[PDB]
Every structure is written in structure tokens, then in C-alpha cells.
Design an enzyme around this catalytic site. Structure first.
Site, mmCIF file in Angstrom:
data_model
loop_
_atom_site.group_PDB
_atom_site.id
_atom_site.type_symbol
_atom_site.label_atom_id
_atom_site.label_comp_id
_atom_site.label_asym_id
_atom_site.label_seq_id
_atom_site.Cartn_x
_atom_site.Cartn_y
_atom_site.Cartn_z
ATOM 1 N N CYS A 106 67.412 -32.509 -41.217
ATOM 2 C CA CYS A 106 67.034 -33.185 -42.468
ATOM 3 C C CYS A 106 67.113 -34.686 -42.259
ATOM 4 O O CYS A 106 68.182 -35.206 -41.928
ATOM 5 C CB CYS A 106 67.951 -32.775 -43.630
ATOM 6 N N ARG A 109 69.303 -37.323 -45.345
ATOM 7 C CA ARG A 109 70.732 -37.098 -45.613
ATOM 8 C C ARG A 109 71.453 -38.323 -46.108
ATOM 9 O O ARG A 109 72.642 -38.225 -46.452
ATOM 10 C CB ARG A 109 71.441 -36.583 -44.342
ATOM 11 N N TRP A 278 62.865 -34.530 -52.858
ATOM 12 C CA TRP A 278 61.506 -35.047 -52.969
ATOM 13 C C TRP A 278 60.849 -35.063 -51.579
ATOM 14 O O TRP A 278 61.496 -34.897 -50.543
ATOM 15 C CB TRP A 278 61.488 -36.436 -53.648
ATOM 16 N N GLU A 283 54.970 -34.782 -44.698
ATOM 17 C CA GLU A 283 54.975 -33.317 -44.763
ATOM 18 C C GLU A 283 53.721 -32.806 -45.466
ATOM 19 O O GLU A 283 53.102 -31.831 -45.031
ATOM 20 C CB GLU A 283 56.235 -32.764 -45.457
HETATM 21 C C1 HEM Z 1 66.234 -35.931 -51.424
HETATM 22 C C2 HEM Z 1 65.297 -36.110 -50.470
HETATM 23 C C3 HEM Z 1 65.113 -35.232 -49.207
HETATM 24 C C4 HEM Z 1 64.263 -35.550 -48.225
HETATM 25 C C5 HEM Z 1 63.380 -36.802 -48.175
HETATM 26 C C6 HEM Z 1 64.299 -34.532 -47.191
HETATM 27 C C7 HEM Z 1 63.573 -34.516 -46.009
HETATM 28 C C8 HEM Z 1 63.552 -33.499 -45.069
HETATM 29 C C9 HEM Z 1 62.585 -33.261 -43.998
HETATM 30 C C10 HEM Z 1 61.346 -34.116 -43.683
HETATM 31 C C11 HEM Z 1 62.952 -32.183 -43.297
HETATM 32 C C12 HEM Z 1 62.186 -31.543 -42.118
HETATM 33 C C13 HEM Z 1 61.349 -30.534 -42.912
HETATM 34 C C14 HEM Z 1 60.274 -29.851 -42.124
HETATM 35 O O1 HEM Z 1 59.412 -30.557 -41.531
HETATM 36 O O2 HEM Z 1 60.267 -28.593 -42.118
HETATM 37 C C15 HEM Z 1 64.154 -31.654 -43.892
HETATM 38 C C16 HEM Z 1 64.861 -30.525 -43.494
HETATM 39 C C17 HEM Z 1 65.962 -29.968 -44.146
HETATM 40 N N1 HEM Z 1 66.526 -30.405 -45.343
HETATM 41 FE FE1 HEM Z 1 66.004 -32.164 -46.201
HETATM 42 N N2 HEM Z 1 65.226 -33.578 -47.604
HETATM 43 C C18 HEM Z 1 65.738 -33.970 -48.835
HETATM 44 C C19 HEM Z 1 66.652 -33.242 -49.537
HETATM 45 C C20 HEM Z 1 67.390 -32.160 -49.091
HETATM 46 C C21 HEM Z 1 68.411 -31.502 -49.873
HETATM 47 C C22 HEM Z 1 68.712 -31.974 -51.317
HETATM 48 C C23 HEM Z 1 68.919 -30.491 -49.120
HETATM 49 C C24 HEM Z 1 70.043 -29.467 -49.440
HETATM 50 C C25 HEM Z 1 70.899 -29.695 -50.451
HETATM 51 C C26 HEM Z 1 68.237 -30.527 -47.834
HETATM 52 C C27 HEM Z 1 68.435 -29.695 -46.756
HETATM 53 C C28 HEM Z 1 67.604 -29.591 -45.655
HETATM 54 C C29 HEM Z 1 67.722 -28.596 -44.613
HETATM 55 C C30 HEM Z 1 68.795 -27.469 -44.527
HETATM 56 C C31 HEM Z 1 66.743 -28.825 -43.717
HETATM 57 C C32 HEM Z 1 66.492 -28.022 -42.426
HETATM 58 C C33 HEM Z 1 65.425 -26.974 -42.701
HETATM 59 C C34 HEM Z 1 64.566 -26.764 -41.483
HETATM 60 O O3 HEM Z 1 65.127 -26.615 -40.362
HETATM 61 O O4 HEM Z 1 63.318 -26.738 -41.648
HETATM 62 N N3 HEM Z 1 67.326 -31.549 -47.853
HETATM 63 N N4 HEM Z 1 64.480 -32.489 -44.947
HETATM 64 C C1 LIG Z 2 64.808 -30.191 -49.895
HETATM 65 C C2 LIG Z 2 63.658 -30.621 -49.012
HETATM 66 C C3 LIG Z 2 63.058 -31.880 -49.140
HETATM 67 C C4 LIG Z 2 61.992 -32.218 -48.294
HETATM 68 N N1 LIG Z 2 61.367 -33.415 -48.359
HETATM 69 N N2 LIG Z 2 61.563 -31.333 -47.383
HETATM 70 C C5 LIG Z 2 62.153 -30.128 -47.233
HETATM 71 C C6 LIG Z 2 61.602 -29.197 -46.189
HETATM 72 O O1 LIG Z 2 62.592 -28.378 -45.605
HETATM 73 C C7 LIG Z 2 62.159 -27.170 -45.133
HETATM 74 C C8 LIG Z 2 60.823 -26.996 -44.786
HETATM 75 C C9 LIG Z 2 60.391 -25.762 -44.316
HETATM 76 C C10 LIG Z 2 58.959 -25.539 -43.914
HETATM 77 C C11 LIG Z 2 58.948 -25.221 -42.420
HETATM 78 N N3 LIG Z 2 58.527 -26.393 -41.649
HETATM 79 C C12 LIG Z 2 57.627 -25.970 -40.570
HETATM 80 C C13 LIG Z 2 56.458 -26.572 -41.325
HETATM 81 F F1 LIG Z 2 55.926 -27.631 -40.661
HETATM 82 C C14 LIG Z 2 57.440 -27.076 -42.358
HETATM 83 C C15 LIG Z 2 61.284 -24.709 -44.198
HETATM 84 C C16 LIG Z 2 62.609 -24.889 -44.550
HETATM 85 F F2 LIG Z 2 63.486 -23.877 -44.441
HETATM 86 C C17 LIG Z 2 63.043 -26.115 -45.012
HETATM 87 F F3 LIG Z 2 64.334 -26.277 -45.361
HETATM 88 C C18 LIG Z 2 63.204 -29.740 -48.045
HETATM 89 CL CL LIG Z 3 56.375 -28.057 -47.150
#
Ligand code: HEM
Ligand SMILES: Cc1cc(N)nc(COc2cc(CCN3CC(F)C3)cc(F)c2F)c1
Ligand SMILES: [Cl-]
Ligand code: HEM
Ligand SMILES: Cc1cc(N)nc(COc2cc(CCN3CC(F)C3)cc(F)c2F)c1
Ligand SMILES: C[C@H](O)[C@H](O)[C@H]1CNc2nc(N)[nH]c(=O)c2N1
Ligand SMILES: C[C@H](O)[C@H](O)[C@H]1CNc2nc(N)[nH]c(=O)c2N1
Ligand SMILES: [Ca+2]
Ligand SMILES: [Cl-]
Ligand SMILES: [Gd]
Ligand SMILES: [Gd]
Ligand SMILES: [Zn+2]
Lengths: 402, 400
Positions: A106, A109, A278, A283
Site C-alpha cells: 500500500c 500508508r 480513495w 489505478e
Molecule cells: C486512503 C488512501 C489510500 C490509498 C491512496 C491507497 C493506495 C494503494 C495502492 C495504489 C495499492 C496497490 C493497489 C493495486 O495496484 O492493486 C494499495 C494496496 C493496498 N492497500 Fe492501500 N490505499 C489507501 C487506503 C487503504 C486503507 C484505508 C487500507 C486498509 C485499512 C489499505 C490497505 C491496503 C492493502 C492491504 C493493500 C495490499 C493489497 C494488494 O496486495 O493488492 N489501503 N493501496
Molecule cells: C483501500 C484502497 C485504496 C486504493 N487506492 N487502492 C486499493 C487497491 O487495493 C487492492 C487492489 C486490488 C486489485 C488487484 N490489483 C491487481 C490489479 F492491477 C489491481 C486487490 C486488492 F486486494 C487490493 F487490496 C485499496
Molecule cells: Cl481497482
């Protein structure tokens, strides 16, 4: 020594001491790295619970207090007699925030402390469940002023099945497996789309149909609930200068809400715990609209831009993809929906890393996932060496329920 | 034990059976992954293993020419302490060490590589002559050709041939009395060495450094390059006419002169190699990295972009036109250049061939995916397994 990490932009070198506390193990060995792969009982319960309780009591600077002694002896006893235990309300808030903080992949964070925790652990059916989710959606959307949130449904317990949300995200567009093998809609969602129909949803035909929710109460088939159209905020995509862009009829939803990961806290496991924040614009723009296996609009944009699509050395793909990202950011800014571009996202992330070093002496980060999918070396986290490892509490992938 | 590797765009699965034969140990453990980090008599057994490799490579193992070569190297080390490579083994180890290079995206080319045997070299002026033939042959008027020159191996008791220059063509980096640098900041250390060892400093953003060449147990010597020998490319854009005026230029030959080559337990601390550039190495990393020429904001100013808000994506719009200028300028000048899209799609074909030749292919995802337009190239969607085969190229401590 611990792993020495280096920033190649400033020259600075840190050491990741935190990585030493990694309890669960990952997929790499000294013989081969697998860091690019997408998917790699009382006494273990008690040691996991003990470490969490200590974390909570470290956070509030009451380590070694009487209340810290007492809560440990308390938890020790409920596990001895029930085989399980229950989190105090404040432990559950602290835990969810730590699970976000601990998420290596993420990039958002920096926000991990500003997270709204909804307790739903006394939920009792798929109907109460849907209700909790509309309240979440309503609160987090906030008419476009997005607020991060997580609703925690009841924990896994022996005897009963889990609550599960079958959808991977709360808001997702249908993906209709067309008859000739193609897809009309989002191809990432053809499976969940097929399951929705089978469970009684009458589908439509657009490229942006919102899917209904399949919610699974314990030991019970999943149920179908339709979202209220006014709860699903959507952004019509237009371009600041390319006026024809709007004719493409492109839409995306406001709220990114991941509904299918498992939250694990002090050894307890929460199968259903949707969280949301958000979007980062890349993405939507690059990944969701330009991946060849996604909506894959990149060539069509380029042709309308009258770019020579007949040779990659014009870099038409990169010119079109930049423009789709401009449109996304400009349309969110227009509709007054919160969104962040990959330059601010990643530079705030560099602010998170520096704090985490001060706070904990390390920060688990997956480089391949923190670097944005366009303009990588333009952002600062490109030149940041990163250490990836697993901390608890944590969000985890889990099997599809079906 | 056989890592499953998936392509997410296509949905194809393959298994890497070749990782089981990984010679050395990487940086990673079950506790923590360090892939992102840049720098992470028993001689007989390495040499034994490389020979089976070699004879298996040529469809005649365990046979007559195999066992002769075996008891050959044995007696060589028992009489000397080291042993001598056959020319053909040297050629084959040269290509294998490239083919095993996990971070190189150009490995589709590993078959065609011109090996120049210079193991009969002594004195820095002899070094310098071997080098300029390489440069001449590999430049080839702009149609680039791949090559490596092998200088004498390490051996016990004796000094070593080291090229102090990191590459053969490098622009000078002059630390200024204001703090910053005129020229290539990467090269502040080598440029100060050249002044300290006699060279007379220029003062331009693109002053080609001399060559500091070192022969065993003597100090290194300056060696200036004939200017007609170092082919360079003035940079201009197909449509933005001001771009030319920025005075940008880059060189034609990527030639790495500071890595160590390892073949059958033998180590060659001097063995420079060269191919041709991928466009994003020039346009994005060397001109746009904050710690290199760092030209993004100047190009952006000239295009009248809005640079006080990140969300106008001015950095991205600028980077693309810089890369477009690189591709146009090399094409205009008939110098071999390859774009990251063409490169990455060729690297897929290399992965897919190598899946049939050897059952896998060591690859370092962070260095295969290009630094602009990642998810737009098909290597972004390809899971990759990184491990260390031998023979190989390696980094080595700086000579001082
Ligand atoms: C508030 C603004 C937030 C932004 C801008 C953000 C952004 C992102 C992005 C760009 C990714 C990679 C996603 C992908 O390409 O699949 C990601 C992954 C992740 N986010 Fe965040 N996120 C936010 C909030 C949160 C919150 C609130 C949580 C949990 C309380 C969270 C938990 C996670 C987790 C567990 C992943 C890993 C999931 C994966 O491996 O695809 N995020 N986040
Ligand atoms: C809370 C939040 C904010 C933000 N801006 N983006 C995300 C995306 O997180 C995840 C995104 C995906 C999608 C898988 N990925 C591979 C594809 F290319 C996107 C799975 C997942 F299990 C996630 F957790 C989450
Ligand atoms: Cl998405
Ligand atoms: C001919 C076309 C070639 C292309 C397009 C190409 C391209 C690249 C690129 C883009 C990189 C990543 C840049 C970096 O390391 O930071 C790289 C690395 C590398 N290449 Fe190639 N290269 C070519 C030829 C060669 C040759 C001829 C050799 C050796 C004989 C070679 C061996 C290597 C090695 C050893 C590395 C990186 C070592 C490391 O960083 O660990 N390549 N190449
Ligand atoms: C023959 C050839 C052709 C080609 N096109 N590119 C190369 C790159 O060589 C290397 C280049 C670098 C420089 C370090 N990195 C930082 C910058 F971003 C590149 C290190 C290294 F270890 C290399 F091997 C070689
Ligand atoms: C195979 C590859 O690791 C995979 O496509 C990853 C790469 N890095 C990523 N990084 C982010 N943020 N999101 C992703 O979906 C991916 N995909
Ligand atoms: C810190 C990080 O490992 C570093 O910036 C890496 C990332 N990927 C790279 N990829 C290439 N081709 N060259 C590089 O120098 C780097 N640098
Ligand atoms: Ca109780
Ligand atoms: Cl270079
Ligand atoms: Gd217009
Ligand atoms: Gd002007
Ligand atoms: Zn690893």
C-alpha cells in the site's frame, strides 16, 4: 547486522532493524527470489495474542503497567477455557490501523492513523450485513469527500461458518462473457458476474453496470442485495482539452473498497472486513483502463489522437496513456471526488518511510507494488531500496468462498 | 521445489525447473526479501562443473574430448594453482555469462557476441590498444555490434588488470564551488581521479573523460581517446525546434568496463562488454534521474507546461518527448537504438525460448520492467524468478 538500505537520490543509508521481528515467513530463499509473484491450536494462539497485547500497550506508552499485566492474564485465561478470546473495542481499533500500517504493497500508508473503524462484530445475518455496508459506503463516500474506513464483521470461531463478502470490491462493474469469447464490461469481473446471474440477478448490457452484492452469513448460501444507485458515486470521464474524449462514454466509481481480504489480529481472524480509501489516478487510468486484459482503450484513444500507431518508436502508447491519466485526474477534480496522482502519492510515501524509521526502525515495502505503473523512475520511491517482510497484524489474501 | 510462474495478461503458467541448479546464494531469506537492493584448490569443483556444462552444450558429454579436458585442468592446477581456458570455452563462457545476467533485458541477443581474446596483454598501452579496436569494431560507423574483450585472468601472487573507468565512454562531472555539479554527477569520483592523475579538466556538460588503465603492480595511466573514435549523437526532437538548442548529446556505445567476469572458477577483473542502448536508459535514467543530468524541469519549462501542480502530469509529458527526441536523434544519425516497447516484447520471446532450452530463465523484475510506461509493456505482467547461475558477470570492489 540488519539489511542496509539505500536511497539513490539523496545518498542516505538506513538499516532496517524492524525486519528482524518478522514472525511469518515469505516465499524467498537464498537460492531464488520470488518477490514478483502476485500470490506467494492454543499455544500459537497465545504467543500471537501476547505479541499483539504488548503492541497495544507499547502504543499507549503503558508498557509494564498493571493494566498491561492484567490484560495479558485475562487473555491467557479466556484462551485456556474457551480456546479463543475477544478483543476489547480499543484493541480492535488499534489492530485495524496496524494492519494497514503493516501492508507492504500500500503506497497510501501515510494515512494509516486516520482510519475510521466500524465495529460490526455483533452482526447476525446477511441482512444486518448489507445494512452495515451501505452505512460504510455512505460514510466513506461522503458525497465525494472521501474518508478512509473499515467495517469489521464477526470473527472466525469454531463451530460456525464465516461471514464472507463474495465480491472482491464493494463497487465493481459487470463483466459479461460475450458469446464469441470476448467481454463486454470489466473482464476482471466475469466470474463474479456469472455467479451473480446464477444467484438471480437480472443483468444489463452496458460496459459500466454496477454489480449487486453477494453476502454470505454463516453456514448459509450467499444472498443478493442491490446497491441503491444514489449510494454509488460515479465520475464521467472527460478531458480538459480533448473534447471528443467525453464521447467515449467512460465512467469510473468514486470509492475503492476492498471486500475480500482477511484481517488477522492477535491470532484472531476476520474473514469479512471491507476497507476503503480513495484512488490513486494511475489505478483507474493506466491499470483499469489501459491493461490489455482490462478495458484496454489505449489504441483507440491513440487513433483519435491521430498518433502513428504503426510503430512503437513514436511512443504513441505512452502519449495516449499519459492523456488518459490527465482525463481521470481532471474529471475527479471536476466532480469534486477525492483522488491523488502518483507523484503526490509516492512523495507522501517517502514521508511515511522516514517516520516509520523513526517510529519503528523499518517499514515493510514491496518495491514492485509501490512504484507506480507509469513514470516509475520519475517518482522518488523508484530510487528507494526497500525491504519486504510480513508483520502482524495484517491483511491477507484468502480463498474464494466458492 | 518447482516455482510456478504466471503471466497475468495471458493466463499462461510455466514452472522454472532451472532455479534448482542455482550456483550461489542471493540476498533473500524466508524472513525478508531484498530483491530491490542494487548491490546485494576447491577451484577444481567450479572448473569441473563448467566443463560438463560446456561439453553438454556441444552434444558430446562424458565422452572422449570430455575426460581429456578434465584430467587436463586437474594437472594444470596441481602444477600452477590456476588453469587455462581454451578459446572456445572462453567464447562459450562469455555468452553464458551474458545469458545468465538476470537484470539484462537485451538477452535475446546472447547468441551474437564477438569475443576478443586479449589474455596475452601486458602494459597499459597494450590495454589501450585492445580497447580501441573494441570501440572501433563495436561502433562500426553506427550499426552497433556486440562484443567483449577479455584481459588476463586473476592469478595468485600477482597484481591485476583493472579499468578504473566505470564505462569506456563517460562524461565528466565537475564539482562546483557552489555545491552542485557541471556535467554528469555520477562521475564526480572518476573525474577527480583523472585530474589527480594528470588529465587537464575541461568545463563542459559533455567532456568525454580519459581512460585510467591499470596493469599489475603499477599505478594507472591516463589514456586520452581519439575524438574521431567516440561516436556521439546531438539530440533534437522531431517537432519541438527549441530542443536542439538545449545542447544535449549522448554517446553511441554502452560499454561497461568495471565488472568482473567469472568462468569455471576463473575470474577476469577486466573484461569490458558493449551492445547498444535502450532508449529509456538515455532519455529517462541518464537525463531525467534527479541525481544525473536532471533535465526534466527545463524541458517542461520550454513546453510551457504547468509546473506548480503535480496533477497536470508535466513530468510525464516532458519525459515522453525527451524519450521521443532520443529515438528520433539516433534514427536520424543511423545509430542502433531500441525502444523499450520493442525491447520488452523481444525479452518475452527470450523468456519463451529459454523455457524450452533450459526450462526457465533468471530475471530480475525490477530491472527488466522499463522506468517509463511499466504496465504498458508485457514484461510488467510476467512473473519472474531471480537466481544466480554460473558463469556470470559480477560487481567488484573499486580498485582504490
Ligand atoms: C486512503 C488512501 C489510500 C490509498 C491512496 C491507497 C493506495 C494503494 C495502492 C495504489 C495499492 C496497490 C493497489 C493495486 O495496484 O492493486 C494499495 C494496496 C493496498 N492497500 Fe492501500 N490505499 C489507501 C487506503 C487503504 C486503507 C484505508 C487500507 C486498509 C485499512 C489499505 C490497505 C491496503 C492493502 C492491504 C493493500 C495490499 C493489497 C494488494 O496486495 O493488492 N489501503 N493501496
Ligand atoms: C483501500 C484502497 C485504496 C486504493 N487506492 N487502492 C486499493 C487497491 O487495493 C487492492 C487492489 C486490488 C486489485 C488487484 N490489483 C491487481 C490489479 F492491477 C489491481 C486487490 C486488492 F486486494 C487490493 F487490496 C485499496
Ligand atoms: Cl481497482
Ligand atoms: C545488445 C543489446 C543490449 C541491450 C538492449 C541491453 C540492455 C540492458 C539494460 C536496459 C540493462 C539494465 C540497465 C542496468 O543494468 O541498470 C542491462 C543490464 C545488463 N546487461 Fe545488457 N544490454 C545489451 C547487451 C548486453 C551485453 C552485450 C552484455 C554482456 C556481454 C550484457 C550484460 C548485462 C549485464 C551484466 C547487465 C547488468 C549487471 C547488473 O546490473 O547486475 N548486456 N542491459
Ligand atoms: C552492454 C549494455 C548495454 C545496455 N544497453 N545497457 C547496459 C547497462 O549496463 C550497466 C549499467 C549500470 C549503471 C547503473 N544503473 C543506474 C543507471 F540507471 C544504470 C550498471 C551495470 F551494472 C550495468 F551492467 C549494458
Ligand atoms: C507480475 C507482477 O508482479 C504484477 O503484475 C504486479 C507488479 N506490480 C504491481 N504493483 C501494483 N501496485 N499493482 C499491481 O497490480 C501490480 N502488479
Ligand atoms: C532502489 C532500486 O533498487 C534502484 O533504483 C533500481 C531499480 N531498478 C533499476 N532498473 C535499472 N534498469 N537500473 C537501475 O539502476 C535500477 N535501479
Ligand atoms: Ca468477555
Ligand atoms: Cl548508460
Ligand atoms: Gd481541443
Ligand atoms: Gd515561448
Ligand atoms: Zn526476494
Amino acid at each position: 547486522k540488519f539489511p542496509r538500505v539505500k536511497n539513490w537520490e539523496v545518498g542516505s543509508i538506513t538499516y532496517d532493524t524492524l525486519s528482524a521481528q518478522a514472525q511469518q515467513d515469505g516465499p524467498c530463499t537464498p537460492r531464488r527470489c520470488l518477490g514478483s509473484l502476485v500470490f506467494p491450536a492454543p499455544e500459537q494462539l497465545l504467543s500471537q495474542a501476547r505479541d499483539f497485547i504488548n503492541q497495544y500497550y507499547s502504543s499507549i506508552k503503558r508498557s509494564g503497567s498493571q493494566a498491561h499485566e492484567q490484560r495479558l492474564q485475562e487473555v491467557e485465561a479466556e484462551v485456556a477455557a474457551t480456546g479463543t478470546y475477544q478483543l476489547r473495542e480499543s484493541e480492535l481499533v488499534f489492530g485495524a490501523k496496524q494492519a494497514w500500517r503493516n501492508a507492504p504493497r500500500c503506497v497510501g500508508r501515510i494515512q494509516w492513523g486516520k482510519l475510521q473503524v466500524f465495529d460490526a462484530r455483533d452482526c447476525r445475518s446477511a441482512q444486518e450485513m448489507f445494512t452495515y455496508i451501505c452505512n460504510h459506503i455512505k460514510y466513506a463516500t461522503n458525497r465525494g469527500n472521501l474518508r478512509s474506513a473499515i467495517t469489521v464483521f464477526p470473527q472466525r470461531c469454531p463451530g460456525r461458518g464465516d461471514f464472507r463478502i463474495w465480491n472482491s470490491q464493494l463497487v465493481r462493474y459487470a463483466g459479461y462473457r460475450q458469446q464469441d469469447g470476448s467481454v463486454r464490461g470489466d473482464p476482471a469481473n466475469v466470474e463474479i458476474t456469472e455467479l451473480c446471474i446464477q444467484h438471480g440477478w437480472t443483468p444489463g448490457n452496458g460496459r459500466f453496470d454496477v454489480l449487486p452484492l453477494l453476502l454470505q452469513a454463516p453456514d448459509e448460501p450467499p444472498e443478493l442485495f442491490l446497491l441503491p444507485p444514489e449510494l454509488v458515486l460515479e465520475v464521467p470521464l472527460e478531458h480538459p482539452t480533448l473534447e471528443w474524449f467525453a464521447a467515449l462514454g467512460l465512467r469510473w466509481y468514486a470509492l475503492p473498497a476492498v471486500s475480500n481480504m482477511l484481517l488477522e489480529i492477535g491470532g484472531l481472524e476476520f474473514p469479512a472486513a471491507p476497507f476503503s480509501g480513495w484512488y490513486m489516478s494511475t489505478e483507474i487510468g493506466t491499470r483499469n483502463l489501459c491493461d490489455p486484459h482490462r478495458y484496454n482503450i489505449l489504441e483507440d484513444v491513440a487513433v483519435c489522437m491521430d498518433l502513428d500507431t504503426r510503430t512503437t518508436s513514436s511512443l504513441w502508447k505512452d502519449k495516449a496513456a499519459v492523456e488518459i491519466n490527465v482525463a481521470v485526474l481532471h474529471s475527479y477534480q471536476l466532480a469534486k471526488v477525492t483522488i491523488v496522482d502518483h507523484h503526490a502519492a509516492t512523495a507522501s510515501f517517502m514521508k511515511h518511510l522516514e517516520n516509520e524509521q523513526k517510529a519503528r526502525g523499518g517499514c515493510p515495502a514491496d518495491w514492485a507494488w509501490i512504484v507506480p505503473p507509469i513514470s516509475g523512475s520519475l517518482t522518488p520511491v523508484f530510487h528507494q531500496e526497500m525491504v519486504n517482510y510480513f508483520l502482524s497484524p495484517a491483511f491477507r489474501y484468502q480463498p474464494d468462498p466458492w
